[PDB]
Amino acid sequence: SVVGGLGGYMLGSAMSRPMIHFGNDWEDRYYRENMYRYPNQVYYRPVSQYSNQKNFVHDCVNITIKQHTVTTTTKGENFTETDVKMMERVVEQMCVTQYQKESQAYYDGRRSS
């Protein structure tokens, strides 16, 4: 499997580093000690096809995940559960964010006011 997933997606290009403290001690330290492995980018489709967050953030998360979980696992890149369960939010953050910005890109108010 190589990048056979993104249905014609794009990359918003290197953005905010999300970081997540979980309110834990151990999940917090774990995350901070490892957060560089998770990409600083996510693959998304033009919001215009949708107009929602879920329909933009859904398999966007899965696709990018599965890229850094399979397309990179080729170099032995082995994210455990205690990794996936963290990056499940990491990829969500930048997409939630890229979505909000893109939300005025596709719209520009330009269809209402």
Curated annotation (Swiss-Prot):
Glycans are attached at N62, N78. Highly expressed in the brain, lung, kidney and heart. Expressed at low levels in the liver and spleen. The normal, monomeric form has a mainly alpha-helical structure. The disease-associated, protease-resistant form forms amyloid fibrils containing a cross-beta spine, formed by a steric zipper of superposed beta-strands. Disease mutations may favor intermolecular contacts via short beta strands, and may thereby trigger oligomerization. This is Major prion protein. It is linked to Found in high quantity in the brain of humans and animals infected with degenerative neurological diseases such as kuru, Creutzfeldt-Jakob disease (CJD), Gerstmann-Straussler syndrome (GSS), scrapie, bovine spongiform encephalopathy (BSE), transmissible mink encephalopathy (TME), etc. A lipid is attached at S112 (GPI-anchor amidated serine). It is found in: Cell membrane; Golgi apparatus. Disulfide bonds join C60-C95. N-glycosylated. The chain holds residues 120 to 231 of 254 of the full protein. Belongs to the prion family. Monomer and homodimer. Has a tendency to aggregate into amyloid fibrils containing a cross-beta spine, formed by a steric zipper of superposed beta-strands. Soluble oligomers may represent an intermediate stage on the path to fibril formation. Copper binding may promote oligomerization. Interacts with GRB2, APP, ERI3/PRNPIP and SYN1. Mislocalized cytosolically exposed PrP interacts with MGRN1; this interaction alters MGRN1 subcellular location and causes lysosomal enlargement. Interacts with APP. Interacts with KIAA1191. Interacts with ADGRG6. It comes from Mus musculus (Mouse). Disruption phenotype: No visible phenotype. Mice develop chronic demyelinating polyneuropathy after 60 weeks. Mice show abnormally low iron levels throughout the body, and are mildly anemic. Iron accumulates in duodenum enterocytes, suggesting impaired transport from the intestine to the blood. Mice deficient for both Prnd and Prnp have the same phenotype as mice lacking Prnd; they are born at the expected Mendelian rate and appear grossly normal and healthy. Females are fertile, but males deficient for both Prnd and Prnp are sterile, in spite of normal mating behavior. Its primary physiological function is unclear. May play a role in neuronal development and synaptic plasticity. May be required for neuronal myelin sheath maintenance. May promote myelin homeostasis through acting as an agonist for ADGRG6 receptor. May play a role in iron uptake and iron homeostasis. Soluble oligomers are toxic to cultured neuroblastoma cells and induce apoptosis (in vitro). Association with GPC1 (via its heparan sulfate chains) targets PRNP to lipid rafts. Also provides Cu(2+) or Zn(2+) for the ascorbate-mediated GPC1 deaminase degradation of its heparan sulfate side chains.
